[PDB]
Amino acid sequence: EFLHAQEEVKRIQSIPLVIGQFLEAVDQNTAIVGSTTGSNYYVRILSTIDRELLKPNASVALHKHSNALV
Amino acid sequence: LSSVIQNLRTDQTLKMIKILSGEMAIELHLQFLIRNNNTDLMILKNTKDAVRNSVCHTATVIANSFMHCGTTSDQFLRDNLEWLARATNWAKFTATASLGVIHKGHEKEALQLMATYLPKDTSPGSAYQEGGGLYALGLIHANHGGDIIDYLLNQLKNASNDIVRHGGSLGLGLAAMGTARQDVYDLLKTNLYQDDAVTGEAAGLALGLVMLGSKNAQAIEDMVGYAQETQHEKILRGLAVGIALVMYGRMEEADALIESLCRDKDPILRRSGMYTVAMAYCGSGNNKAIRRLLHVAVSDVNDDVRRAAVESLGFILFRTPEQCPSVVSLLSESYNPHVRYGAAMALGICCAGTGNKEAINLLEPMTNDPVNYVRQGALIASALIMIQQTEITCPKVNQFRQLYSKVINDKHDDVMAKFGAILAQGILDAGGHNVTISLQSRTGHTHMPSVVGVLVFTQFWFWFPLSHFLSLAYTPTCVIGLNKDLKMPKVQYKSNCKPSTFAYPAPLEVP
């Protein structure tokens, strides 16, 4: 059952997304980012993202409206 | 009894039959419940005024009928009639049906009684009305059969239209239950075969009652064949219960039928397998039923199978109430709410009559579950258990009493949740606090009509006007001393302990 619901949350990785830059993570499941529109944000991240690949200044993609790491 | 009466008849004997067939006991119970009547109408007045016109309207005129069960106290519906007239369509049917529960067992001259609240009060049709009338005449005689049967049978034949047949087959399949009268089985099967989607549900259920527990080589084929090859759904949702009643305690005998139904592709037959393995093993506590009846809950792929599979456990264990919380208490934390609802009902139904503490301990935190219908389930279950208790007889009662009130008063809450609370108000005060639920006779024999009562009741999920089927389960709690002439002596008794433990809940009708 866990495998069945595991990928069910990639409705969020839909096609139209904004590109932003990664800054730093407060605590796991939350971080701060700077969008290409120029304004910074403090936002939630999604769980299934592997944490061993986000490093200082790596281009990530954010939800268009909610502004959440995806 | 129907057998032994023949060996007895072939004088005092001519009146002894009046005890053997129950004629006395019924009217003694009636006289007790009418005299000892005691209710505070203020609660109804409140919930009435809190009604903002909605589904919730119906829940009053069902619930009211619970608290006046057996007692002929019409005087709540006799007045405030204009608000009652606001009902319409199918709901009107249910309102008329409640006129049964208030008169339950008021056997004699019933015919003129309902003809004072006629099926043709204006000869209107409104055939929700008249079908109601038949459903009431079925409920008065709920297990007495007798001279009414040959009336209702005729009255089914000449039904104009397909709602009258619905009430008719329900009433007839109610009164004549257990008898296996072959003419009745013929008439019901021919109406089932007519294959109309509303009547075939009523008839498909009733068909199961008149064969109750008498396993029958032929009829099970004549109905599983039909169920296995028809396209309307309601017909299947009727038959899925209609099958199981052909087994009753038959222990190992039914197992062949079981292995058929549980293999089926069709989800509703796969379900009805579970009801069968519940009714086949009541009270036995046999591990061999549990080991599979629970395995279905953990893996099957369609939710109503999971709910019915979990909820059935409430019947296997009811002879040892201590056990159920030891197994369900974990399962109540499942992710998908259907299982949680089933757990609430299993728990409520295992230990229905007692004040058992751990059951309530687990039921309390469910009342805030986000998903409204499990709140409805927990409220009903909470109210079935804890029947008749006082704050001395168990603590943790008077907070529920007000919980129900506040949730019914809340202006911004789901109707489907606040249906449960308004049903619970009536459950907790049934009959005028003089009646109780039990699956268990005084001598220790399992009691049949209440078992059927609750199994049918739990289907109110699918079809509302079915809820009155709980009124089978209110056995009265009283004692009577009787003279040799069967006169009533004016004797007294005493009781050993501080009166506050027994008392009626001290009505607090401020105005």
């Binding site: 096609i15 139209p16 997304l17 904004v18 590109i19 969008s35 290409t36 529109t37 993609a61 | -």
Partner: protein, 49 residues
């Protein structure tokens, strides 16, 4: 009257068979999917779209 303009922009790279990165001329970058018939062989990095 029943017609609408369309935004101009520039392509940076093709990511997968259906994911392209574009930069609008005005500002924010984006991730956007193609239309089926457009001969994806032709969207070299740098073409206006």
């Amino acid at each position: 009257l029943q017609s609408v303009g369309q935004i101009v922009g520039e392509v940076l790279k093709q990511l997968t068979e259906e994911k392209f990165i574009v930069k609008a001329t005005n500002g924010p970058r984006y991730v956007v999917g193609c239309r089926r018939q457009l001969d994806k062989s032709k969207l070299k990095p740098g073409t206006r779209v």
